[PDB]
Design a protein around this ligand. Structure first.
Ligand SMILES: Nc1nc2c(ncn2[C@@H]2O[C@H](COP(=O)(O)OP(=O)(O)OP(=O)(O)O)[C@@H](O)[C@H]2O)c(=O)[nH]1
Ligand SMILES: Nc1nc2c(ncn2[C@@H]2O[C@H](COP(=O)(O)OP(=O)(O)OP(=O)(O)O)[C@@H](O)[C@H]2O)c(=O)[nH]1
Ligand SMILES: Nc1nc2c(ncn2[C@@H]2O[C@H](COP(=O)(O)OP(=O)(O)O)[C@@H](O)[C@H]2O)c(=O)[nH]1
Ligand SMILES: Nc1nc2c(ncn2[C@@H]2O[C@H](COP(=O)(O)OP(=O)(O)O)[C@@H](O)[C@H]2O)c(=O)[nH]1
Lengths: 428, 93, 433, 436, 428
């Protein structure tokens, strides 16, 4: 048996995982009170990846919830599937992070880090064979940036043979919900370079693009916005949760996706995405699923992937399917879209198929892309940072809370030293 | 709803009704209610605390947060184990 | 849990406070005496006690009576603790010396004792709301002494200031140019962030966008009470983008010295214009950013914005404000500083404004916009020129000096404000290197 | 089983006695006539009350006062029936603000009577626990008679616990110019024999009643009633059942580090005037902080200009002990309450399960009250003030002729001055930190 | 049958034992009035381990209650279980405790010792083989310290080869309920170092720490605080009363957790410790019983196990669990953190498994710990002694009752010569 421990920091990441645990509970047939009221017998066979057995029948997710503001815990307890976590893992704080990476990393975050590693230690020891951990956070903003990267650093230095999956909401080119977003982002990605094994960059502008152009929605709510994120976060972890031909768990993905130890930033995708008005005129098959996977309309990072070359493609299909077409459609993609696929990885797709799709559908597909188009996001964050670092704007807070002048330039040096390789292997 | 708090009536501020002779609040010349609630026509009771500007609950009201709680304590925290009980009986219908 | 303590000093701040608690009782649900005719919503600005007689976390301190005696004989005599309504005995007489130097010592120990009692009953203290003007002697001197003492004692905690600006054109006293500079010299080094609002801009918005030519100060202060309720909203309630007071003071204050935001409010309609307009989100965002609803009479065109905090309340979907911020960024007349590309912080709350019996109509969407402009330096220079003209031949200086003032501190405050002018010019100059 | 003998000497002592017995009447079921309307099962009445054949319950006390009209107030007013008619030891002739008259000529016709009364009052005591001497440092009776009575009781029952409740002289107002001449002698004589003595300053009671009770013109009926609540809160462990029951021998082993330093100060928690108690919360943390606030202290001395040596907290009512312990931790880590460097553990904890009972009047009916008793170095300033006043009055030999022509020898003022010089030297000696 | 007598001295230990008779009355099945009202004969099988028979089956405990002040005697008599205790062994005095060690040891407190030893001798022969001596008290304060340790000294001089255990409450670093905690406690430990075989140092602050962090109370009263002590004091003597596998009596415990004759100070522990809320979502297993047994939050001392190298561990599990896991995770604890267990004692842990769970659960585990972590307790109490011994403070009462400087000097020297053998083994 195999386990994944889910931990989350920040208001954003807490809502990420609230929608994720709702989606996983609906997929495993688990009611809000925690028991199994389901339909399929094999649906209970690998509950113990995200869930924990408890004496009588209400399973408990192996999730620890942390936030410096003690109101997001109130929100997630008052949510729909709120009475499902352990009350012991609500490791909150009597403070407010204040959108400050300094105050999430070198302060009361670092004073609560001992307790959050204690409960993470408890849930990790209560396992048998751990693949690793899952952290959901916003790369722009406080709490989930500073505490998130500190927590990743400690967990990576503690368990070096386990993989880390961080689902990060990177700041968007369109607007800015936090004014120190690139300050938080550069310092956070400095730690994300040498730590995690699987980072997934999700953009809210891309979420709007999907839900208005493809889903045809009018009032897009956050429940929908990281419902769409919960979809892919469930779609990555399905081969070790349900049976099927050609299984590929998280490490089997991570071996194939990243060619180099640092280029581990993925832009996700879900593409049986049908509007409620055009769903009734659908003819669900592998060709249009693999056509919907490969456009700049279901790509959840705010960088059009046709500004760079794909390094590695993933395709976690779900549903009862046969797959000669799932093979030759990747052949067709590599043959036609040839200027955006590398030549030094010949046949740079990975394919996996799960037996059971998400409920309410018959056949789905999760797309995980590693390209040279995250170039543009990282570069734009770099000029967005250097616009304010040149005249010391919003820096007195970090310097007062205890941060140093040289380490900001160290973070920007690592920023540019991630920017340069994704130049040179996109241009050979 | 300050009269619903505690059963005997709230301690009304000293109206024109009492005002005993040979006592220090014995003003002469239009005596109505409102000066005895306005605190600064009120010269003090001179032996008793200053007159109220309001009506306050009676002699048998406990003051402050007196948290009674609902936990049974550690006899209920050790002397019972709430094994998972369920009420499936599903009204799916 | 997330408490915050309000101290109301001077007549202006006290009547802002009466409007504010008039608003807050109707917002939460406690009736004017203080009891609730029946959770973690009132435990932010209000405490709890025996039965239900909820007491606000406010210190109404003033050097004269008759400003607090209105509260003590009003309907609100039951809301407040009888000792936290603190009155002095002598008037400050528009004298910064009589507000900070001579008559401050008979009251400062008592007001700090009540402040530390209220802070003792705060499990989490984010900050303070300090209500006054830059005008009269109380709100000039006692404010300064309070900020010195609170910055000494509670240096790691937030002190938010709510200051009424001395109007560049109308005014009500002859030594406001003296008092404003004398109070900002000392509050610059201690106050974390000072939301500042002018009287005659509220005068303008009441005469134009409120369709009434005769509201009095009980309605003038009501808009500021709405501004305070809008700005401290995610602390009291829950929303989409909760914005915390630490978040305001970290995302609106660029440099250690530039901490003077200007507030403005979205719709101020008056119950005979509600059913004839839609009041969408893009148009109220453009209404907040158009150069006439600013609550300080300075022209935003003659300057550059630095950072703005939008706080939408009511039924607001987040992608309407996403589109509104996009449109504001594309509109050319709003000119930003080139060194700050992220110009905005969005906050969204699901709770609409409460409708007090008055003139403000029931609108299901309302954004308070705070701007940090560089046009406020023009208003600073407008006060500085008045100070120079009055200080040219020592007008009204003997009243200050005879009460304990030192002459050189006038000149010290003068080139401190000159230095603030050069800091504004230095943060406003563009990129040439 | 656990009883104390309360002697009330002089006008101040007997007025505080009238107030305290006014309190204990309604503290128990003993209606102010003597009987109890209970249809009973008790054994809490026996500590300060007897048990006669049917129900009368005479108290264990003695009102002694060398002048009449005050014992006649007792035997003319409401409470005469409750007291033993022979317990009322009135004298015949007032001591007239004169220690010489209180100690040297007119005591000898009443000292034998009062010693006899104290003796056969202690005969109705299985375990006697202590002596409660109520007096002042002022008038002739309450200086000289309490000095001589203190000497004779320390001769006769010296092993027992000995508590004084005394009204300390005012620093600014006073009521006698021979307040220093009488305080100097009564403290010089009672220093060696008193086990501990709790001080009250009328100025501080005036200010605490003006500020907290918010009363502008109340009389000594309201001065002494706070002292009544103080003594009822102190002697409550021996009356009721609680959590940390404290004994008088614990109090005396407790509140003094050294044999002669035996002057702690009282402080009473919420003294809110029931017109105000609705507007605040009266929690454990704020009542513990209100004890240490430099405005609710029962005497004028500045706590910041001094160090607390050892203090005892008597929480009474529905108080959870770990809120007490948390408030103790917060008070300990607060940096404005400085202690002596040789005493890490300086706090005492006591919890009793019986809430305060209030007479109809000033005090709010609160189910929680802590009495704080602090032996501290802050009283050295008041001692120095009184000694400077004594120096400036004795340097011209004024008012000495009444003392010396009565039978008192003139030179005792001198060695009283060096006795207080030794006391000041000891209060300075306890103040330095450890260098060795 | 093996018997033991339970003396309680003071206020503290008097209340602890007086409610411990209540807590074992539930496990046995006698009501307040002495009549046996149970459900199985297997509880009646060994009533004569703590309970003496009386005619009509009206079973009376053997417990010599002692105090110098008849107030706590009335408190026990008017408590919940009042009509259970023998009228003859209510030995009291019409005196005052005065919380004075000299008063309890070398004054009129010694004038009741003859009667106390007489009434102890009254049940010393109404029994078969008196294995041990329970005695409950507090090291700080009077009566329980002074007269308690003189009672221990006299009863060991009278019976020399029986094991005795003292459940004793020690002062807390944080606070102080007594100004003479060091003066009472160092003088109390001076005899306990060379006398007793099983102490149980149970501070006051960790009980509130358990009730606040683990049990999640809001108004922890003294019954709630004393009850964990009573649960440990019942669970330690369960292999002596009820059947099971790997049974161990008190001398077995003494042999296994006394490596050297002076290092016998034990850290207690009880670990089905759950809150009322998280008690729902909890999953009772011997693995997590071991986990929350060795977690440093359920231990009842201000002695950090992460700052104290362990010497001997005992675990009295109770319940019908299989033996292989209660051996296996006990091995895996030492294999996990072997650097916090000694190497000169390999195999430094003891397992006992009684058959019967405590009434009201399905299993439990009493934890007994002899570690080096008591060195910080002794160091801190020695510094508290020294700080007030420098000025000779608070000493005139002791010298009046019959103390001198050389006795306190010997006590402090013995405290330092007790701190040395508990650090010089951790230094290997
Ligand atoms: N909203 C509101 N503003 C006021 C009010 N009263 C005064 N102001 C403004 O405050 C400025 C000066 O008044 P204050 O600062 O309150 O004067 P003060 O605090 O009483 O100080 P003293 O004159 O020394 O007594 C004026 O220019 C007004 O613009 C008021 O009642 N409501
Ligand atoms: N509680 C209370 N205290 C009083 C009263 N009258 C006087 N005192 C205190 O007593 C002091 C002066 O009176 P005493 O010292 O008691 O006089 P005395 O001890 O009776 O001796 P004589 O003057 O000879 O009668 C004053 O400083 C007051 O503090 C009273 O009526 N009630
Ligand atoms: N997609 C989605 N996004 C959310 C949700 N809740 C919050 N967000 C996003 O969270 C971001 C801000 O997070 P952040 O400021 O870092 O919160 P913090 O971690 O508490 O500081 C915003 O840009 C929102 O887009 C949700 O339920 N679904
Ligand atoms: N666990 C527990 N500890 C107590 C109890 N009662 C008192 N204590 C502790 O006992 C200590 C003081 O008791 P002590 O002075 O020895 O009482 P004495 O024996 O009469 O002198 C305090 O620090 C209390 O924390 C109780 O009922 N349970």
């Amino acid at each position: 048996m195999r386990e994944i421990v889910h931990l989350q920091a920040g208001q954003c990441g807490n809502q990420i995982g609230a929608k994720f645990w709702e989606v996983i509970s609906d997929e495993h047939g688990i009611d809000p009170t925690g028991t199994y009221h389901g339909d399929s017998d094999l649906q209970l066979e690998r509950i113990n990846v995200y869930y924990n057995e408890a004496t009588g029948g209400k399973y408990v997710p192996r999730a620890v919830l942390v936030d410096l503001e003690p109101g997001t815990m109130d929100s997630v307890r008052s949510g729909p599937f709120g009475q499902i976590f352990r009350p012991d893992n609500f490791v909150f704080g009597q403070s407010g992070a204040g959108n400050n990476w300094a105050k999430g990393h070198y302060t009361e975050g670092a004073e609560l880090v001992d307790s959050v590693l204690d409960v993470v230690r408890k849930e990790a020891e209560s396992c048998d064979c751990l693949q690793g951990f899952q952290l959901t956070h916003s790369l722009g903003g406080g709490t989930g940036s500073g505490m998130g990267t500190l927590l990743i650093s400690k967990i990576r230095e503690e368990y070096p043979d386990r993989i880390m999956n961080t689902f990060s909401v990177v700041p968007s080119p369109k607007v800015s919900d936090t004014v120190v977003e690139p300050y938080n982002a550069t310092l956070s990605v400095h730690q994300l370079v040498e730590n995690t094994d699987e980072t997934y960059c999700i953009d809210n502008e891309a979420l709007y693009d999907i839900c208005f152009r493809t889903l045809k929605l009018t009032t897009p709510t956050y429940g929908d916005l990281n419902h769409l994120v919960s979809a892919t976060m469930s779609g990555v972890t399905t081969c070790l949760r349900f049976p099927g031909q050609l299984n590929a768990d998280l490490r089997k993905l991570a071996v194939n996706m990243v060619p180099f130890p640092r280029l581990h930033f993925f832009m996700p995708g879900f593409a049986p995405l049908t509007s409620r008005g055009s769903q009734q005129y659908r003819a669900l098959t592998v060709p249009e699923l693999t056509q919907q996977m490969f456009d700049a309309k279901n790509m959840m990072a705010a960088c059009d992937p046709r500004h760079g070359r794909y390094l590695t493609v993933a395709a976690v299909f779900r549903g009862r399917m046969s797959m000669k077409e799932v093979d030759e459609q990747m052949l067709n993609v590599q043959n036609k879209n040839s200027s955006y696929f590398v030549e030094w990885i010949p046949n740079n797709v990975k394919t996996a198929v799960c037996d059971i799709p998400p409920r309410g559908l018959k056949m789905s597909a999760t797309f995980i892309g590693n390209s040279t188009a995250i170039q543009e996001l990282f570069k734009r964050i770099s000029e967005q940072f250097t616009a304010m670092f040149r005249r010391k704007a919003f820096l007195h807070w970090y310097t007062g809370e205890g941060m140093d002048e040289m380490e900001f330039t160290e973070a920007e040096s690592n920023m540019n030293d991630l920017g340069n390789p994704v130049v040179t292997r996109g241009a050979c | 709803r300050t009269v619903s708090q505690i059963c005997p009536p709230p301690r009304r501020p000293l109206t024109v009704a009492d005002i005993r002779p040979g006592m220090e609040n014995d003003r002469l010349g239009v005596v109505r209610d409102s000066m005895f609630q306005n605190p600064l026509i009120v010269k003090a009771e001179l032996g008793k605390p200053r007159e109220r500007s309001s009506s306050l609950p009676g002699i048998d009201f406990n003051y402050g947060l007196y948290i009674r709680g609902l936990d049974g304590g550690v006899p209920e925290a050790i002397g019972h184990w709430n094994v998972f009980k369920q009420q499936p009986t599903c009204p799916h219908e | 849990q997330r408490e915050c303590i309000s101290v109301h000093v001077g007549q202006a701040g006290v009547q802002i406070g009466n409007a504010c608690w008039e608003l807050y009782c109707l917002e939460h649900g406690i009736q004017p005496d203080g009891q609730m005719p029946s959770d973690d919503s009132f435990n932010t600005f209000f405490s709890e006690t025996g039965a239900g007689k909820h007491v606000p976390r406010a210190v109404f301190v003033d050097l004269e009576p008759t400003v607090i005696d209105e509260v003590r004989t009003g309907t609100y005599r039951q809301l407040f603790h009888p000792e936290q309504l603190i009155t002095g005995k002598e008037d400050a007489a528009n004298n910064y010396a009589r507000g900070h130097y001579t008559i401050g010592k008979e009251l400062i120990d008592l007001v700090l004792d009540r402040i530390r009692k209220l802070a003792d009953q705060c499990t989490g203290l984010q900050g303070f709301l300090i209500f006054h003007s830059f005008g009269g002697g109380t709100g000039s001197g006692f404010t300064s002494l309070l900020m010195e003492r609170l910055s000494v004692d509670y240096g790691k905690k937030s002190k938010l200031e709510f200051s009424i600006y001395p109007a560049p054109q109308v005014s009500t006293a002859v030594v406001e140019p003296y008092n404003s500079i004398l109070t900002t010299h000392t509050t610059l080094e201690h106050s974390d962030c000072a939301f500042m609002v002018d009287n005659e801009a509220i005068y303008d918005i009441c005469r134009r966008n409120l369709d009434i030519e005769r509201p009095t100060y009980t309605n003038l202060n009501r808009l500021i009470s709405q501004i305070v309720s809008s700005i401290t909203a995610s602390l009291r309630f829950d929303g989409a983008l909760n914005v915390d007071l630490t978040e305001f003071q970290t995302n609106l204050v660029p440099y250690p010295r530039i901490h003077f935001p200007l507030a403005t409010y979205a719709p101020v309609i008056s119950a005979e214009k509600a059913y004839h307009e839609q009041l969408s989100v893009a148009e109220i965002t453009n209404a907040c950013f158009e150069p006439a609803n600013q609550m300080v009479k300075c022209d935003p065109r003659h300057g550059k914005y630095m950072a703005c905090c939008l706080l939408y309340r009511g039924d607001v979907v987040p992608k309407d404000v996403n589109a509104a911020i996009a449109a504001i960024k594309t509109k050319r007349s709003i000119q930003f500083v080139d060194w700050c590309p992220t110009g905005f912080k969005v906050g969204i709350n699901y709770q609409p404004p409460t409708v007090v019996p008055g003139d403000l109509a029931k609108v299901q969407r309302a954004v308070c916009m705070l701007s940090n402009t560089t046009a406020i330096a023009e208003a600073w220079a407008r006060l500085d020129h008045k100070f120079d003209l009055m200080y040219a031949k020592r007008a009204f200086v003997h009243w200050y000096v005879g009460e304990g003032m030192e002459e050189g501190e006038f000149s010290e405050a003068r080139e401190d404000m000159a230095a603030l002018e050069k800091d504004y010019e230095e943060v406003g100059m563009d990129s040439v290197e």
